[PDB]
Amino acid sequence: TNILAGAAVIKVLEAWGVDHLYGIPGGSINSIMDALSAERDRIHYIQVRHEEVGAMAAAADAKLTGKIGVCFGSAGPGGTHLMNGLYDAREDHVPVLALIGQFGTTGEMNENPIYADVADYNVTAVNAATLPHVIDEAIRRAYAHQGVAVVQIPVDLPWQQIPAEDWYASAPEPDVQAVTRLTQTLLAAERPLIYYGIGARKAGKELEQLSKTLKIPLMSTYPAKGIVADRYPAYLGSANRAAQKPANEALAQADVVLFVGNNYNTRYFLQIDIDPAKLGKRHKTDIAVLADAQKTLAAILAQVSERESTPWWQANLANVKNWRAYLASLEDKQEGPLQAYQVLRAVNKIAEPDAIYSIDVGDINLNANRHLKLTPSNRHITSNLFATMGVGIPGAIAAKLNYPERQVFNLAGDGGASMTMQDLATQVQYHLPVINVVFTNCQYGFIKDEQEDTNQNDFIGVEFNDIDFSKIADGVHMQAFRVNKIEQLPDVFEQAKAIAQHEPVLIDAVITGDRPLPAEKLRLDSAMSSAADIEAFKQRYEAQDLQPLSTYLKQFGLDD
Amino acid sequence: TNILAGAAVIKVLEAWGVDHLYGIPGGSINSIMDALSAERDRIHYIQVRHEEVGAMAAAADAKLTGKIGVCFGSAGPGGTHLMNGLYDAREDHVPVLALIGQFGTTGMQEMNENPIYADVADYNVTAVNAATLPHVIDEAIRRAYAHQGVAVVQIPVDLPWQQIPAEDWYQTPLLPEPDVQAVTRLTQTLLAAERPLIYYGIGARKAGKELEQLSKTLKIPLMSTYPAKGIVADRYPAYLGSANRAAQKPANEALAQADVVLFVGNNYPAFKNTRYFLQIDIDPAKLGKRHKTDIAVLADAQKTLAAILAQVSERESTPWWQANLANVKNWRAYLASLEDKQEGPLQAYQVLRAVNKIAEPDAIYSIDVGDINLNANRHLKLTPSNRHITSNLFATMGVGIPGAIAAKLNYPERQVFNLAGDGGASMTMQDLATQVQYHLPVINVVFTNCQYGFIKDEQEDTNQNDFIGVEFNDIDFSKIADGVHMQAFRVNKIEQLPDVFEQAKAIAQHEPVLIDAVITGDRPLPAEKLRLDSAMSSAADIEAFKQRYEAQDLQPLSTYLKQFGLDDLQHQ
Amino acid sequence: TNILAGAAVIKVLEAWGVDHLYGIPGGSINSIMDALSAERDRIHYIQVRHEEVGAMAAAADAKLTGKIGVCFGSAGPGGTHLMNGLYDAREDHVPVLALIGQFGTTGEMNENPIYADVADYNVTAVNAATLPHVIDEAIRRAYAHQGVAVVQIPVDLPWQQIPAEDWPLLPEPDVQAVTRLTQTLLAAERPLIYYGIGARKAGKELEQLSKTLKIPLMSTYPAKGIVADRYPAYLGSANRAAQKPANEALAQADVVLFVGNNNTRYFLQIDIDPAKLGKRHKTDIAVLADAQKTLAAILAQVSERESTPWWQANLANVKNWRAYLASLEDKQEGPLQAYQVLRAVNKIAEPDAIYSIDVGDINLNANRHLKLTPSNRHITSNLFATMGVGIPGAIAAKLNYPERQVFNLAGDGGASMTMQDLATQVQYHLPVINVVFTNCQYGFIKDEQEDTNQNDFIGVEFNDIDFSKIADGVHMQAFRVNKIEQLPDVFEQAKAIAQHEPVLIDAVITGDRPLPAEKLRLDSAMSSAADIEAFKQRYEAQDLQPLSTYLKQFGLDD
Ligand SMILES: Cc1ncc(C[n+]2csc(CCOP(=O)(O)OP(=O)(O)O)c2C)c(N)n1
Ligand SMILES: Cc1ncc(C[n+]2csc(CCOP(=O)(O)OP(=O)(O)O)c2C)c(N)n1
Ligand SMILES: Cc1ncc(C[n+]2csc(CCOP(=O)(O)OP(=O)(O)O)c2C)c(N)n1
Ligand SMILES: [Mg+2]
Ligand SMILES: [Mg+2]
Ligand SMILES: [Mg+2]
Ligand code: NA
Ligand code: NA
């Protein structure tokens, strides 16, 4: 028996469990549209307002669920609009299929070169009969390479009849010597760190147990926030840069670092990874164990005993408390000019235990990293390695489509919200009760801070005219609020919390131009800087009560 | 002696007369920003809210002035946001320079960026050395002009902050006359034709006078490509419009009837009854191109048309001439009947009449992509004093706003419109803020049908199942404008138009304004699928057609041919 | 009414005047082969032994005639073998069409990204009916961009019946600017005319203008022969096949006129392409017009000037240089060197001879020793500078000009790379005279390593390959000579074999370094006394004078 080549493509997608896909129709892709139309019962098509949002939401689908994301764009400008979302997925290593329209084989640009760089698989379908098989292979290449597969489909092909009976959709324990050699080196260290990334997703319980047992402080990569609960008193934050003070400071001091599902004064580097091509990378590393994170951590645990509090442990616990109190003093202001810190507190107050956070790119990464309180039941996404602005809105859309029953925030700077603002209309249209929080500083704040640090001449391109996002949201028929004072927060967030039981809501938070404390440029220690520099720093960042790790090392007898 | 490499880069730009440039800063491009900062008296940096608008605006600059446009974007996602503006430049064949940030040659997303631009660019290099950086920029610019396309330079951020010797760093063809025997052959074929057409594209942009003189002397009807609208004034009675699919009825119908077609600065973007193809073009690669071409002349359009003119004199009306004239009058009367409605549900047609009404004689129109191309092609009344831009060959939506920014920056003393559908306006809406920020008095008109109307009509013609992706929720663009602090109006009835457009006219003496026209889901008459030939299509289809398009009084070309004693393509 | 798509393709090629094309068949291109088979009397298919040679030969076709060269390769490995020839065509700016086989649309490497960088037009045909259109457009884009067009052809489409019946301006000179240019030129104290191949058609005028105004001539390497080499005021080329007199003169010049090209006060330039106007140094006067018309127009508004000291110093430098060159060429006995071999080539060369020249020391040596006139042609890989082009250049030369004498001058390194296609000259009866200069080195790279490297030589001295035995292998008459005295009889024999069949001479030469015109040790006011004498000894340069000697001798400073 026969079938339209288009209808078979859609069946290939359903066979792989694709629940929703994103795009904007064009004549060059209307035969795929026709097939999607017949299947609206079985697959959910989300019409976006800019195809980049579709490509970003697809990456975000795959970041959230591990399942391939699917987007499409019309020939020429529809497909090229996909680029920021497709690079995002290439660089964060998530599977995404993109379909691109193309004029019919009989019925004039060469599209294939356009996708050669971003895609791990990039083919133009030549024949209706193999069209479904090409889609099937694209999907398995995407999964195989954890990246982008691109298929360009000449528009006549999906309208051709083909046979149905012919197509298909084709849908270990660690080394016990090494584990001991690893444990021993870890045991002997004076300043041990356990430093994990998303490779340790399944291993949060073990990480926390090992940390408290052996009195060893924990730090994560930025995407690894929430794998171990933030409130855990020996969790230092992340290093590198949405960087938190305690992690940045301890790293300089450690003598042995255990890298768990990661790959970033240290004499020994210890490493656990599932992938051998990852065992060496940043500096000559001394013990590399090839194995699963959860198991190797359980194998360490099964052969160690509770040590008692060491100096290192106690200086770190003290630094963490001091940092946390600093953050709390920012959060706890009750009245006055609104700043990012209180908006994040108010977010914390309304957040449910399993909230999902879609985070844009800018000061929000730094601020969310420090103020959000996450646990293993939270999820948070962003564009990590490509770091494209604009992903807050699309990430929130995907989150809500995958998890209709969970609370979803979109946290975004105004520069980033502006880039994908139109797709606020997409939340209204598809009834996705996202809570959007726009941090309005009228600046590219992250880049102003960078220019402050490097440029000789005046600021340029980093301060701009205000956009009132509560009117933008009104424009797309979404309820919204604009606040500019701390004391407005409680009531506005309660309203948002309730509106989002049924419909999207936006809060436009007009915040000050205050720079968030920079963890790599501390001026806290009387040794390394002037008394006046320290006074200016403390004034600027309201950090009068913040102490350097210097202070706590000495309080416990350790050298700096 | 001694300058920073970044400062030398900006001096290159100034030397080539770059007045303004677009982009969004990032750490990977903060050293070029620093150098822009020092030169802010001599070059105007325009901060846009999405880098695609900067690249689209750059293409639009080059379209309007022939001067290279300049945009930039930070490493990674800033530069990739440029793609739609760059492909638009490439496909419309206008020079654009894009500068891409990259991390410094010291700490060097550690992406290889160079392969990203290999397909769009005619010149695509990573600067390796501070001292040759200015030469690289200068070569990039030369190559963009040479190829009339995109040049891309990736610039490691440490380089513009390096000192270099100031002591090291750093044209228009007048053409020969046409071959006279070849022009005579061409003139004789043209004169002998019973049904001749002159079909010109933007290659004929300097030849509007000759085109119109030749047309009236010899009683030969004119049609144009869509971009060539306005080279001859629309009001000229023998201008048939364009053929293709912003297509106008008279041009479309005449193509099928013609025995001889003269392509001038064109090369066809279908004829069947055409015995001879005549072509005048400046590029020998273009001579030929479709389905065998008969006489081909390598020369400038203006000189060649003046040569032809010099060797002919006035002919009397021909039946062909009077038939096309009558067909044009009938088409125009149909369009005016749509425009002249005074009350009722707003349609695009009355919106454009209201634009015509407030427009200055030298107004510039930035036009987006969708039903607006078809409608503005039919309703706008342009002359050689106007300019219009759109994305012609790449046909990317979103260019209305960026083009109007570029237009107002090049010509601050000229009235500038942005005509955009709601789908296209949505894609670059954030950059309404930029017209506000830079005080650019654009008149924005959004055509709100809550549809991808162009695509709906395509699904209507081809799809077996129900519409999908083509009807969507409203966005109120007057509130979007209020969001960015721009005065604005929403209108949904014909009778609201005069007063709203007059306030807009006046507001735009000082500041941007936006009008959000809520319009019906009516489908504009498809000039490519007429059902009027009381012979060629059932009596049922004809009645259905005339009713849907309010085309009760429209006659097919066949009627006017018959009136003047000429056969059709129904008689073979 | 109907035609096979493949036949239509071959008809497009014929319609465009394509006489011959090169390639190696495979199943992925067997339908185009089938169509070539049916047309053997209207288009000549040359089967090569390595596809790179077919691409390089295609490039040489276009350099010699200005008409598009055509090559093809089978899917995957046959097409990728083309690359050195496609890049040669891209960089030397000549139109070449390349057809690549591909698995059938219905019947799976993605081949299109392979050609993206080399090609100005790079398309997969998707449909039998438009195929002839695709080929025609490819040819037009190749000509338009003076570069490579690539078409991938699914092997099923050429076997499909399709309807048979559905298949530049030079600017002239702005006469104020020509007067302006003439003036700065005339005002000049140490003027030079520096031309490249853009002055192809203007050799007469360049020479008249030089004799009239007493201005010395310089060329780019590829412009050698545009003005007879005998002309006593031709200084040679500057850069790196460079000859001493041009090298020295340029450093002393105050005005330089650049004609069809791309201490100095003014840069004058004539060129046909606006993008070229100012491309090297900073220029005062730039003329956008045709090289020949412009030089004719300059000639009209000028009059016979008299001998000058700059004129006389250059003439005398040129005489000294040519006497040094002649002295190497005139050795009569002893260990053979390249100099005597080139002399021996000069002595049997006919006046309208074509030289295909490979890459290495040979470009330098032949630039100095060959005596060319406007009646000669010479081709090589100029900008890409790929080794191996000697053999395929000669094949293409003899195929375009069966009635003219054709030399292939190659080093051993470069001849090794395409040696297999000596079999192609035999097979197609193409009477090339091949001369292989055997130093058992990558001589040019050894010299560079001498200049730059701290450690010993590496990779630049290798074992001997006897090329007369190689030629004997593919059934071509050949000789090996290693002494100066052997040349006359061998070259006279070679000369006469080449009236009928290809022949090869394997000239075993010394490892002597040819004089480096950029590393001269001849100025006592500049180089050490032990240096200068060492230099002279090594290069047999005892009679050679720096230009400064001659500047002293006629009044001029530095
Ligand atoms: C598309 C894109 N352009 C530029 C950048 C470089 N960039 C990084 S952070 C940033 C500023 C973000 O500004 P905003 O969203 O307002 O956040 P803020 O720092 O002000 O909170 C920029 C422009 C990027 N990552 N993506
Ligand atoms: C970026 C992009 N995506 C898709 C297309 C295909 N396309 C052409 S017209 C059109 C619809 C335009 O709709 P709108 O702007 O609302 O104008 P309308 O036809 O409804 O007046 C689309 C989606 C395109 N050209 N560019
Ligand atoms: C395919 C290729 N590989 C390497 C080079 C670099 N190269 C330039 S000259 C040269 C030496 C050529 O040696 P040979 O043919 O023996 O000539 P010789 O200098 O010894 O006369 C080399 C290796 C090149 N141009 N092409
Ligand atoms: Mg901001
Ligand atoms: Mg619309
Ligand atoms: Mg050698
Ligand atoms: Na946008
Ligand atoms: Na070989």
UniProtKB/Swiss-Prot annotation, chain A:
Pfam families per UniProt: TPP_enzyme_C (PF02775), TPP_enzyme_M (PF00205), TPP_enzyme_N (PF02776)
Cofactor(s) required for function per UniProt: FAD; Mg(2+); thiamine diphosphate
EC number: 1.2.3.3
UniProt-annotated binding residues for Mg(2+): 414, 441, 443
Cofactor note (record): Binds 1 FAD per subunit. Binds 1 Mg(2+) ion per subunit.
InterPro entries, alphabetized: DHS-like_NAD/FAD-binding_dom, POXB-like, Pyruvate_oxidase, THDP-binding, Thiamin_PyroP_enz_cen_dom, Thiamin_PyroP_enz_TPP-bd_dom, TPP-bd_CS, TPP_enzyme_TPP-bd
Single Gene Ontology MF annotation: thiamine pyrophosphate binding
Free-text comment on this protein's domains from its UniProt entry: Each monomer is divided into three domains, each of which contains a six-stranded parallel beta sheet surrounded by alpha helices.
Membership in a protein family: Belongs to the TPP enzyme family.
Protein known as: Pyruvate oxidase
